[PDB]
């Protein structure tokens, strides 16, 4: 210290030395990039942080943004690993940074945008700890925090009291901060590669798409998510209907549009969270209440329309999915599903499960989903019905938006690289039926298998080391390999790679036939009925 002291455009920062394997790294945690959105500043745009004097304690993570916490199994890591580990508060706008030792000069910078369907998440999660990527890949790992729920996305377009995309603005404000302050940490702002999972990847994609938020980075990684996902965006008319119902549920009396926001700004943060899910219009799964709204400024149209027309940042993209995307979401609503049983659902249950997966669908569209996912030779097989729902939910919400993104991106000669994480853990906490579930590639990307306190196989250490290299090499080169073999993806050649405890193998089609149903035909059907 030495390396534990950093002076930036906004103030001075006190670090922390952290040992990693045979060496160590430096960490700076709880660095604000904005002012606290409290009282009358709640639901507003993020105000940039007022510079401080003198040195700020950046030795501890700060609390996560107020959110709905998953209390389904309080004594289970499978659910608990995703919950806030250092508390919750409205004052939550902080970024965390991991720097190699000795401090580099112009090293690559990876910025993590966490998932949680815009209603949850924390940069402080153990699964997003940057220690291993920083030490093994000699890379700078930054993790930002962004408001979630009504607090981050209460949509009232036009109104300044709730501009609608407040959460993606918080993300933007952090990206703006990284540019103006990462070189004193030993990084290169010319090599800022943004990356995220689920809503995090939707956010990443919403940064490749929006206007004053595409110069803020060089490259992108979208893990198990896309901005054009059905759960990712909302109609300004719906976001308004949602905001008003929140008021009515909380016993508000309002005439004006800003008369609403005033009433909500008074209600306790838990009072609001406890009513947040009652706004959803249908009995559904993978549908989140307060999410990004197409306003007219941040979103000049829909991400679908934007990706189609090409209104975006043309740059290198690494994309991919897990073997079982849907399985996590099934156990949060669908009849007959549990992690505590085989979830051998009846034909009756399968049908109601389809209706909950395509909730905005009319009877003819539901019939189409049932046609593709039914074995017309073996209709009453409870194992096929379970596998079929896991596929509907995975395809509709995750894999198919990703393939449309990947096709629309190569519809510009952009080098797009696609993976499939399909190695299932030797020590996974979920039942066999759930396969390789949503979010379980992250621990491999972040180097967790290298930790001897975590009980992983030496074969799992190898794959983590490899994925860390691929992620780093892409952030460096724009090609996740080194010549002495991972190919590009186009709408024409939809090749992808298998990430597992086996040598990189190549596969030709990343669900092209089925995603043609979801992306080409299913919308067309609704435009005709």
């Amino acid at each position: 210290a030495g390396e534990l002291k950093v002076s930036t455009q906004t103030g001075s920062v006190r670090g922390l030395s952290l040992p990693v394997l045979d060496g160590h790294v430096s960490a700076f945690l709880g660095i604000p990039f904005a002012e606290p959105p409290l009282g009358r500043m709640r639901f507003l745009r993020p105000e940039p942080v007022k510079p401080w004097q003198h040195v700020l304690d950046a030795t501890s993570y700060k609390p996560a943004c107020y959110q709905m916490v998953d209390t389904s199994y309080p004594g289970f890591q499978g659910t608990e690993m995703w919950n806030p580990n250092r508390g919750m508060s409205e004052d939550c706008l902080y970024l965390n940074i991991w720097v190699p030792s000795p401090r580099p000069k112009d090293a690559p910078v990876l910025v993590w945008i966490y998932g949680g369907g815009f209603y949850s998440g924390a940069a402080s999660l153990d699964v997003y700890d940057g220690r291993f990527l920083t030490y093994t890949q000699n890379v700078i790992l930054v993790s930002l925090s962004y408001r979630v729920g009504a607090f981050g996305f209460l949509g009232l377009p036009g109104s300044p009291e709730a501009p609608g995309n407040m959460g993606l603005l918080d993300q933007r404000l952090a990206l703006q901060w990284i540019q103006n302050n990462i070189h004193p940490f030993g990084g290169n702002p010319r090599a800022v590669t943004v990356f995220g999972e689920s809503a995090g990847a939707a956010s990443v994609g919403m940064h490749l798409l929006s206007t004053q938020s595409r110069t803020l980075f060089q490259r992108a990684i979208l893990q198990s998510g896309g901005p054009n996902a059905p759960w990712a965006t909302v109609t300004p008319a719906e976001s308004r209907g949602r905001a008003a119902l929140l008021g009515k549920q909380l016993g508000c009396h309002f005439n004006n549009d800003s008369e609403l926001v005033s009433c909500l700004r008074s209600k306790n943060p838990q009072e609001l969270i406890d009513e947040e899910w009652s706004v959803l219009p249908y009995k559904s799964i993978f549908r989140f209440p307060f999410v990004p709204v197409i306003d007219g400024d941040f979103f000049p149209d829909t991400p679908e329309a934007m990706l189609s027309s090409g209104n975006f940042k043309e740059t290198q993209v690494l994309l991919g999915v897990v073997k079982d995307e849907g399985s996590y979401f099934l156990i949060y609503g669908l009849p007959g599903f549990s992690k505590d049983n085989e979830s051998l659902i009846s034909r009756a249950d399968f049908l109601e499960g389809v209706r909950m997966s395509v909730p905005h669908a009319n009877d003819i569209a539901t019939d189409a989903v049932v046609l593709q996912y039914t074995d017309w030779q073996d209709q009453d097989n409870r194992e096929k019905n379970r596998e079929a729902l896991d596929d509907i939910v995975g395809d509709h919400n995750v894999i198919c938006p990703v393939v449309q993104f990947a096709n629309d991106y190569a519809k510009r000669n952009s080098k797009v690289y696609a993976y499939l994480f399909d190695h299932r853990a030797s020590n996974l906490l979920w039942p066999p039926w759930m396969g390789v579930p949503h979010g379980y590639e992250i621990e491999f990307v972040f180097g967790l298998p290298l930790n001897d306190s975590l009980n992983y196989t030496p074969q799992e250490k190898e794959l983590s080391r490899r994925m860390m290299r691929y992620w780093a090499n892409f952030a460096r080169t724009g090609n996740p390999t080194d010549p002495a073999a991972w190919p590009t993806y186009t709408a024409s050649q939809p090749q992808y790679v298998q990430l597992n405890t086996q040598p990189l193998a190549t596969q030709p089609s990343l669900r092209a036939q089925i995603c043609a149903f979801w992306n080409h035909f299913l919308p067309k059907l609704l435009n005709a009925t």
């Epitope: 709905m68 916490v69 209390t71 389904s72 199994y73 309080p74 004594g75 289970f76 890591q77 499978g78 608990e80 919950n83 838990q270 969270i273 406890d274 009513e275 899910w277 549990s338 992690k339 505590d340 906490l429």
Partner: antibody, heavy 125, light 107 residues
Framework: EVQLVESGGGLVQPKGSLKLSCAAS????????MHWVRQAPGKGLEWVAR??????????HYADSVKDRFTISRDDSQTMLYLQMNNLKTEDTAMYYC????????????????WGQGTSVTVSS | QIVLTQSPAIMSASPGEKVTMTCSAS?????MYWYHQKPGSSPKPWIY???NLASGVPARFSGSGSGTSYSLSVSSVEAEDAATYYC?????????FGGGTKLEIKR
């Protein structure tokens, strides 16, 4: 001070019915997950059922030996927990505790941090 | 049905002795919870999430464990510690409890 007061217990003939009540006080009942736990004489503890908050859509989960015979319910306005027990069996003879689970907000997160004194249930002819 | 096996069923220790109770799970669990039970009283929370002592529990008590193997220790046992200690898991449904350990203090 946190208090849990069970009532409704007693002697019921086999195949019979009984409804247990629980008077809760000293905490924001509606924000808590409540449970019913039983203890046969001289034996250990057996979980009966859970009921989550209104936010967690009053989601009920049952012990298999009880699924579809017992029903766990709430009335947050009266701060009351209930256990409707139908088709009672000699095996159900036990002390029934009305228990509170510690919220994310408490140090006791997930634990049965408060148990009532119990209500004795005897299933006999 | 995750089966929790407490051993010994009955434990006897002189005042001031270090004592360790174990809880063995049929399948690996993320955390273990402990409660104590005295005669004519309902159980009381004792340890939260493997190692965090409950409000009012003396410092001489400690918890620990991982995967399938969990334990509760008393550094220096006192007469006050005569009770039955049960372990609980809240990893999978149904939440289950061990058979318990009757801690008896010699005199």
């Amino acid at each position: 001070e946190v208090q849990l007061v069970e009532s409704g217990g007693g002697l019921v003939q086999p195949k019979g019915s009984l409804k247990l009540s629980c008077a809760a006080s000293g905490f924001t009942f509606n924000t808590y997950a409540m449970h019913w736990v039983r203890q046969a004489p001289g034996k250990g503890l057996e979980w009966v059922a859970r009921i989550r908050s209104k936010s967690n859509k009053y989601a009920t989960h049952y012990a298999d030996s009880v699924k579809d015979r017992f029903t766990i319910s709430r009335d947050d306005s009266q701060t009351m927990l209930y256990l409707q027990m139908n088709n009672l069996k000699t095996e159900d003879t036990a002390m029934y505790y009305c228990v509170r689970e510690g919220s994310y907000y408490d140090s006791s997160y997930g634990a049965m941090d408060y148990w009532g004194q119990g209500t004795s249930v005897t299933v006999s002819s | 049905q995750i089966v929790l096996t407490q051993s010994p069923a009955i434990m006897s220790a002189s005042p001031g002795e270090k004592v360790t109770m174990t809880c063995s799970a049929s399948s690996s669990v993320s955390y273990m919870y402990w409660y104590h039970q005295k005669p004519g009283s309902s159980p009381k929370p004792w340890i939260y999430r493997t190692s965090n002592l409950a409000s009012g529990v003396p410092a001489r008590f400690s918890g620990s464990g991982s995967g399938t193997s969990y334990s509760l220790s008393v550094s220096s046992v006192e007469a006050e510690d005569a009770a039955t200690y049960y372990c609980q898991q809240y990893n999978s449904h149904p939440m289950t409890f061990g058979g318990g350990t009757k801690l008896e203090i010699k005199r």
